[PDB]
Structures are given as C-alpha cells and as structure tokens.
Amino acid sequence: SPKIILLFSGKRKSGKDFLTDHLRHILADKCEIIKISQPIKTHWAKKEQYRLEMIKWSEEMRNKDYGCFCKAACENAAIKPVWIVSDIRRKTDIRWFKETYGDIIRTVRITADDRTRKERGFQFQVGVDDATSECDLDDYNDWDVVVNNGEGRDSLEEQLDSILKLVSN
Template sequence: MQNEIPTLIVLLNGKRKSGKDFLAELLNKRYRQEMIVWGERMRAVDNGYFCRLALEMAGADRYPVWIVSDTRRRTDISWFREKYGDRVKTIQVKANLTTRELRGFVFTKGVDDAESECDLDGVTGWDLTVVNNGDPRPLDEAVDTVTAWCTPGRSA
C-alpha cells in the first residue's frame, strides 16, 4: 500500500461561500510547480495522455456533446482533431489584463509564463473568439453559436 497512487485524496466540504474553493486554490498553489513538471514529463511520453484521462474520468462516451473547459496546448487540439476530425470546434476566451486582475489574477513567474499557459498564445484560426471583459452579450452570442453547432440544419 505504501507506493500506491494517489498517495493522498483531499475531499473538501462546506456550505456555499464557506471558503472551500479558496482553500483548494491555496493548496493548488503550493503544488502547482510540481504538477507542471510532472505533466510535462507525461506529455513528452504521450501527448494524448491527459486528453484520454479527462474523457475517461468524465464518462464522456455517455454524452453526445463534450465541453472541454481548459485546453492548454497545441497538442491537445491536435489530438482531438486527429481523433475526431470536423466534430471538433475551438473557442478562445479572452479578457484584458485589467479584467483578469479584477477577477483575482496575479502574475506568478514560472506558472503564468509556462508552456501550460502560453502554448496557445500564437494560435490563429479559432472557430470562435469570445471577449469576456464583463459585457454578457458576447457570452450569450457564444452560447447561441454553440447551440447552433449542436443543432442539425442550423448554422451559426
């Protein structure tokens, strides 16, 4: 039992707004650098490892539409496109630095300038780009577009 992975599973509980997410974020900050290094080692061996793992964990094969909320690398997009072809649509969500800072963003060297945050910066050709600086209309339009993608015979 000593070398079993995972070695620890932390389950947080609390009422809404009790601070569960805040505590989880503090814990994640402590281990983020180590997770990035480990993730890079795994991707060097198998660039689809985390894509497959996420799909498996979500039980994705039970659902007709998949929303992957945190695509971080060109290899992620390539893996999905190679496996699923034109069923894949890409959306880039952008917010200016001021808006991100108002939402709590503080630049952390070694994290925010790492490949996991920057690899998709130069990518063009997104199926949709959404500017999310506080105006709800672009988000509403994005929902309408994705709904149209999901509805046969409708175009967006």
C-alpha cells in the same frame, strides 16, 4: 462517438470556467464536461505542494506521449451528444483531439483584456502566467469561435448563444 466536441481555451480570469459552467447547466443531460487535467489530480490523489510535485511530472508524461491525459480523460467520459472539454491548454491537446475524432472538433477561445482580468483578482504570477500552460495557444490561428469576455464583450446571453449555435442542429 459524441456528435460534437467543444474544446475551450482561455487564460485564467478570462471567464472560460464561468462560461463552460453556464453552458453545462443549459445543455444538462445532452453534454459531458471533460477536464484533461483531471487525470493529473487523480494520479496525485493516489496548492504550491500540488504544483511542485505535479508540474514537472505531468510535463514529462506529456513529453513522452502528447495524448496521455487527453486519452485518460476521454476513456472515462460518458458518451453524450456534446462533449465540453473545459481546459485545453496546448497545441498538442488540439492535435490529439483532431487526430482521434476528426472534424467533430470545434475550438473556442475565451479572451479578456488585462484591466478586466485585474478586476477579477488577476495578479501576475511568473511561472504561471509566462508558462506554456497559460501561453501555448496565444498564437493559435485556427479558432472556430473567439469570445471577447473583456472590454466590449456582448451580453452573457449573446456569448452563450454564440457557442450554443455550434450544437443547435
């Protein structure tokens, strides 16, 4: 298996994608990036057009088998000491990872205040921002790391170091 699996959660415009991308570049060939939405995009290939056709379909597939997209994304991942799962959204995603891989999971939440998100171009979109996809982990209470990436955030170097501390041994 991988030695550690980092599950990243965050709302859009939080900077989770920015931080995961920096972390991937730093860890280079010690890590694999995994996107559990990739099986959904790959099924579609075989923007509102994507959402209209895929949101209800993916919700129904996950309602029938909570791990379907997590299993598909992990089956296709190269084994590397560190796995970065950049797009965990639901409690059932964390549940599937913990059931499958046990105590090598670490959960990381990236957060940003609404003023900061608006500076990054955030405009409230009903049905995106009120949706399970953006809100299902808002009340999760078992985070290993929470990264403030809004008002009062640490330096980018210190943010990355707080995550790298998880994989440094």
